[PDB]
């Protein structure tokens, strides 16, 4: 199965995990199954336990101005692996490593933001830290610990959604509609610009842009918008006419490197990723539960010489087949 | 009794402010983090360093029982640089508070003024404003010679006495309003609303922030209320046809408190928990096997 291990800088206290990816369903989150390994010596005088911090940095340079660390822990759970059920993966680890293998399991609650970062670090990142300490609250050195970083992501559901539509009229009965609600990363987006002009005023050009909403909430709700793409056309309509045409747009990162505040998927290391996937929240129960919320909405604007509409859609990865490597496959 | 404690205050402020400002001026030698937030501290440090360079002249002034030796050669520039440095320092504190508020409440910030070029432009503008407001102190001073001591004071009685009763009222009131009232008021409106007004107490961090905000506010008030309040009260009672006799005898104590505040600002603002670690100064993920 080729499980993942990360040995500490110290010559012991290694951590075994089956996979470095935990999906977040609309109902429950997969348990963080794993086994922490340690030699019989050096443990009898202390107690071993594994932490799980849902860190959230919202600053730069880790400035400490006026005692403001710029960080935030959203979910901290500690389980004592020291002896006082197990899954198939957990029991297989026990029979292989030996008797001195201590399972540890967490339970991530729902309504938690996924691991999403921002292009410059700021963003939501998780971490699994394992260290041994009898006091369970004393300071632990960096070398006697494992900085094993994990990420939690959401995937597109099997059931699709209805086609978005908007009918914002102004005195120009614009009627836009997307091809489908579910869109995968790197796939083209087709929007209809079927309009109906009746006033004497004449439109100059049609501007179509796709903007990413990074609904970051720490103290007050924020509505950062990044035009990840732009399809400024030159079409126009006279009174009593129309310009029904299927314009095609495709968001990507090749032309969005210079943009600041862009939201991307969680990065284990400095290796680069794609745009941040849309985050799904429970219907009705969704509220200000901190973290970062990513949503996508296209915009069709008419420049008369304005009428604007918003059509939300979901941009998410499909279900992986075997496992996501979470790194540049053709690296270096 | 006030003279001895004031002199001790000046000595301690100079001794703890020269290295305190010097160390933060270089920003850990050469890292220097050319970002607006970090440049605030550097500019504050250099302003307070100039203030501390010109402080020992006032130290001799207080120590020698008002026996200020030189005239237009020394005090005519000393007054100007003192006003410039002090008002630049208070303006730096208030702009630091406003900047902290704006990037902590987190609205769309990079669009309006959060750029390095805008930071340089606003720094030049605020320095020019400080120079302009310290202007008339430079070009309006007389040096009276009484009882073997020369006092560099204001010279409203000189030049043209055609001016009406309002002679020193406008400048002192402007200094009290612009320099004290606006910065203190905006610091209150920011910090108390953010911290004391229990807004979103869930994320109102009770760590070092919650205490450092209060200590900054209390230090600022305790070190800036004496000077301005005493100056305003003294001017009022003197112009109200009372002559004041000799009732204060302790106004240099206010200046010593201001010097102590200038000493405390770089040490408390920059030299903090994270900076303590800087001042004092992994592995690779593999893979194993598994039985099928």
């Amino acid at each position: 199965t080729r499980v993942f291990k990360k040995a500490s800088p110290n010559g012991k206290l290694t951590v075994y995990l089956g996979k470095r990816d935990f999906v977040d369903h609309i109902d429950l989150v997969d348990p963080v199954d794993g086994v922490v390994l340690v030699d019989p010596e050096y443990l009898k005088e202390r107690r071993v336990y594994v932490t799980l911090t849902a860190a959230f940095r919202y600053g730069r340079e880790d400035l400490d101005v006026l005692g403001l660390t710029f960080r935030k822990d959203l979910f901290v759970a500690n389980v004592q692996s020291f002896p006082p059920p197990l899954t198939r993966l957990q029991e297989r680890l026990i029979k292989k490593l030996g008797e001195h293998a201590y399972p540890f399991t967490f339970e991530i609650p729902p309504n938690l933001p996924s691991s999403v970062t921002l292009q410059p670090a700021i963003g939501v990142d998780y971490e699994v830290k394992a260290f041994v300490a009898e006091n369970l609250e004393e300071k632990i050195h960096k070398r006697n610990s494992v900085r094993l970083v994990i990420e939690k992501v959401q995937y597109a559901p099997e059931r699709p959604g209805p086609q978005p539509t908007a009918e914002t009229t102004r005195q120009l009965h614009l009627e836009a509609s997307l091809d489908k609600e579910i869109y995968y990363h790197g796939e083209p987006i087709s929007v209809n610009v079927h309009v109906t002009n009746n006033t004497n005023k004449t439109v100059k050009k049609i501007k179509i842009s796709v903007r990413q909403y990074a609904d970051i909430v720490l103290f007050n709700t924020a509505q950062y918008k990044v035009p990840v793409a732009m399809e400024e056309a030159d079409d126009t309509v006279a009174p009593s006419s129309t310009f029904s045409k299927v314009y095609t747009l495709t968001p990507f990162l090749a032309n969005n490197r210079e943009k600041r505040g862009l939201a991307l998927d969680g990065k284990l290391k400095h290796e680069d990723t794609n745009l941040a996937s849309s985050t799904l929240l429970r219907e009705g129960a969704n509220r200000e539960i901190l973290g970062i919320i990513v949503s996508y909405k296209v915009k069709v604007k008419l420049v008369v010489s304005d009428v604007a509409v918003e059509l939300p859609f979901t941009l998410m990865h499909p279900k992986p087949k075997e496992e996501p490597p979470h790194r540049e496959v053709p690296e270096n | 009794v006030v003279h001895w404690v004031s002199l001790v205050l000046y000595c301690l402020a100079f001794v703890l402010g020269i290295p305190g400002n010097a160390i933060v001026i270089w920003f850990t030698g050469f890292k220097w983090k050319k970002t607006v937030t970090t440049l605030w501290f550097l500019n504050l440090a250099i302003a307070d360093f100039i203030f501390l360079l010109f402080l020992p002249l006032y130290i001799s002034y207080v120590a020698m029982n008002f026996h200020w030796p030189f005239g237009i050669w020394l005090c005519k520039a000393n007054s100007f640089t003192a006003q410039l440095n002090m008002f630049a320092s208070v303006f730096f504190l208030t702009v630091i508070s406003l900047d902290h508020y704006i990037h902590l409440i987190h609205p769309v910030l990079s669009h309006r003024h959060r750029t390095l070029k805008n930071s340089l432009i606003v720094i030049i503008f605020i320095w020019l404003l400080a120079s302009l407001i310290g202007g008339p102190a430079l070009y309006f001073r007389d040096t009276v010679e009484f009882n073997n001591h020369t006092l560099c004071y204001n010279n409203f009685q000189k030049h043209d006495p055609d001016l009406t009763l309002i002679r020193h009222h406008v400048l002192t009131w402007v200094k009290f309003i612009i320099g004290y009232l606006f910065p203190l008021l905006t610091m209150s409106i920011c910090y108390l609303c953010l911290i004391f007004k229990v807004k979103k107490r869930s994320i109102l961090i009770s760590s070092r922030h919650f205490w450092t905000i209060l200590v900054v506010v209390v230090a600022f008030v305790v070190c800036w209320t004496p000077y301005h309040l005493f100056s305003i009260w003294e001017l009022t009672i003197h112009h109200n046809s009372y002559s004041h006799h000799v009732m204060q005898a302790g106004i240099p104590l206010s200046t010593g408190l201001a010097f102590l505040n200038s000493c405390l600002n770089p040490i408390l603002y920059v030299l903090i928990s994270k900076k303590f670690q800087a001042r004092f100064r992994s592995c690779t993920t593999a893979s194993s096997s598994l039985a099928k």
Epitope: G11, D39, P40, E41 | S288
Partner: nanobody, 112 residues
Framework: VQLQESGGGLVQAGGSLRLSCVVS????????MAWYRRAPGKHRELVAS???????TYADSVKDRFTISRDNAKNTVYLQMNSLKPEDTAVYYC????????WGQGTQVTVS
């Protein structure tokens, strides 16, 4: 982290091998180094512990047969072979008990 080692060979039955494993790089400190043998077609199995003090444990099928001596002063560990078995042949590996080191090439032994 080169983890150079040698000592493999061909022995008919009941011959001493005296495998050698040297450690270069990180300081030995007071960590315990184990010895894992990979049977042909099988996985690695724990054999010895060799803790900081004298506390040595063997496996069920190798008890009272092997003998591990540690010379951490020169960062070397060794295994003693006595009264071998035809099934004892395996590709022996040298690594820390918690398997915190990269798995280098191991010596090959053959029993006939």
């Amino acid at each position: 982290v080169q983890l150079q080692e040698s000592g493999g060979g061909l022995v008919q039955a009941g011959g001493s091998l005296r495998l050698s494993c040297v450690v270069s790089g990180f300081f030995f400190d007071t960590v315990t180094m184990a010895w894992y043998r990979r049977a042909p077609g099988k996985h690695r199995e724990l054999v010895a512990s060799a803790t900081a003090g004298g506390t040595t444990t063997y496996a069920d099928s190798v008890k009272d047969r092997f003998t591990i001596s540690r010379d951490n002063a020169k960062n070397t560990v060794y295994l003693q072979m006595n009264s071998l078995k035809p099934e004892d042949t395996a590709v022996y590996y040298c690594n820390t008990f918690v398997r915190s080191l990269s798995w280098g090439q191991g010596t090959q032994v053959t029993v006939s």
